Write an enzyme that holds these catalytic residues in place. Sequence first.
Site, mmCIF file in Angstrom:
data_model
loop_
_atom_site.group_PDB
_atom_site.id
_atom_site.type_symbol
_atom_site.label_atom_id
_atom_site.label_comp_id
_atom_site.label_asym_id
_atom_site.label_seq_id
_atom_site.Cartn_x
_atom_site.Cartn_y
_atom_site.Cartn_z
ATOM 1 N N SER A 45 9.081 9.095 15.614
ATOM 2 C CA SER A 45 10.478 9.505 15.521
ATOM 3 C C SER A 45 10.831 10.891 16.034
ATOM 4 O O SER A 45 12.011 11.237 16.069
ATOM 5 C CB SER A 45 10.997 9.358 14.076
ATOM 6 N N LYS A 48 13.508 11.172 18.750
ATOM 7 C CA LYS A 48 14.940 11.056 18.508
ATOM 8 C C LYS A 48 15.717 12.347 18.753
ATOM 9 O O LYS A 48 16.936 12.296 18.967
ATOM 10 C CB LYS A 48 15.196 10.518 17.090
ATOM 11 N N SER A 105 15.977 9.244 10.381
ATOM 12 C CA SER A 105 14.982 8.505 11.147
ATOM 13 C C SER A 105 15.341 7.012 11.252
ATOM 14 O O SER A 105 14.456 6.165 11.224
ATOM 15 C CB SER A 105 13.609 8.637 10.459
ATOM 16 N N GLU A 141 12.182 1.039 19.599
ATOM 17 C CA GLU A 141 11.707 0.954 18.221
ATOM 18 C C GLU A 141 11.601 -0.541 17.916
ATOM 19 O O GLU A 141 12.468 -1.310 18.317
ATOM 20 C CB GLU A 141 12.718 1.580 17.260
ATOM 21 N N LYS A 209 12.344 17.704 12.697
ATOM 22 C CA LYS A 209 12.333 16.245 12.858
ATOM 23 C C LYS A 209 10.876 15.792 12.709
ATOM 24 O O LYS A 209 9.988 16.230 13.458
ATOM 25 C CB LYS A 209 12.878 15.813 14.239
ATOM 26 N N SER A 210 10.626 14.932 11.729
ATOM 27 C CA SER A 210 9.283 14.424 11.510
ATOM 28 C C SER A 210 9.129 13.003 12.040
ATOM 29 O O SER A 210 10.081 12.390 12.541
ATOM 30 C CB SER A 210 8.972 14.437 10.031
ATOM 31 N N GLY A 211 7.908 12.493 11.954
ATOM 32 C CA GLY A 211 7.645 11.147 12.413
ATOM 33 C C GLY A 211 6.357 10.597 11.844
ATOM 34 O O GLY A 211 5.447 11.357 11.484
ATOM 35 N N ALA A 212 6.296 9.269 11.746
ATOM 36 C CA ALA A 212 5.112 8.573 11.232
ATOM 37 C C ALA A 212 4.970 7.292 12.052
ATOM 38 O O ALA A 212 5.967 6.647 12.393
ATOM 39 C CB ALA A 212 5.285 8.229 9.745
#
EC number: 3.5.2.6
Length: 263
Positions: A45, A48, A105, A141, A209-212
């Site tokens: 993510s 984004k 997200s 996605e 902004k994080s993501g997994a």
Amino acid sequence: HPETLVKVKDAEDQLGARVGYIELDLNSGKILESFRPEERFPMMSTFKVLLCGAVLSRVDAGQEQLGRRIHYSQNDLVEYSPVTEKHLTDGMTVRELCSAAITMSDNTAANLLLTTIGGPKELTAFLHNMGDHVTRLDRWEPELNEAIPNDERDTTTPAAMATTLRKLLTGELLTLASRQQLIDWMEADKVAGPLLRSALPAGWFIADKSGAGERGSRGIIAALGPDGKPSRIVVIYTTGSQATMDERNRQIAEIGASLIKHW
């Protein structure tokens, strides 16, 4: 500072996976510290932010409107769409979609936005066009989160991402109003609580902004600094660990605690 690399290297040992790291001076562009800076990692993510940057570039150029309304349906919904799954009837505007994609997200929001700019191919062209010859988005996605070992699809490097974020938040790339809109969406990020934000001192500014993703992938990009203003960019990515989400979040938070301690 060298002590933060002690923590980054330690993170690698505890997670039994590669960890990429970079701390960049926001004003000067100078790399302050790094680890595996040019090695590739899945963006998840974190892409984004780049997507909405391209969207805002379209707005500035008179090719898109933030208030434009997008209509979608059940068919468009993919996993993890907490905001979009609630507006099927009347749709959402470009502005509300970037807000959902960045602060929550929301995967469907991202897909709808990618559609407006022409897909992954065009986001990649936007990036190459602004000097990022590394970062690439190839899929939509949720497939972009696959994190297949050695696969270059949908990856960036810590150096490439940090430099790109610096250009987006301080360059003439975006008008002043768009620059601030992008920052405001990142500042309102609601799903990155256990990461860098858990190490941020009172009074400090952070837009992130994080993501997994699959196969233990996890990461975060951020602009942060003392007294309410950002002054450095930090990028942290890891992939390949069999560790739990909590363990992964803790390592990122500890790297964060260290870079704040040695600021």
